[PDB]
């Protein structure tokens, strides 16, 4: 029963920032209706705006999202997660 605790999601405005922290108790996205697509290698729709980082030798993943738009409002899941909602209002 290895777990994946994700936190940091929330509701921001168009142009705001967020910081998703993922601690593996032991980054893909899914929009409302579409299929799970990979976000972070970087997706073509988030290259230059999202930054990924990892602690060397540890099982932790941080995603800093700057310049958020209404096309990034979805549920983010972790993979190596239950899901964390990240909405951006227009």
């Amino acid at each position: 029963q290895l777990q994946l605790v994700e936190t940091g999601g929330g509701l921001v405005q168009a142009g705001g920032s967020l910081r998703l922290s993922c601690v593996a108790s032991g980054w893909f996205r899914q929009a409302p209706g579409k299929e799970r697509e990979f976000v972070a290698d970087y997706a073509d729709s988030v290259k230059g705006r999202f930054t990924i980082s990892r602690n060397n030798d540890k099982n932790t993943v941080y995603l800093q999202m700057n310049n958020l738009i209404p096309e990034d409002t979805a549920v983010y899941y972790c993979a190596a997660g239950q899901g964390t909602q990240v909405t951006v209002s227009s």
Binding site: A24, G26, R54, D57, K58, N59, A80
Partner: peptide, 8 residues
């Protein structure tokens, strides 16, 4: 591929 996990 669990280096991140095998290393710990």
């Amino acid at each position: 591929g669990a280096i991140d996990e095998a290393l710990e």
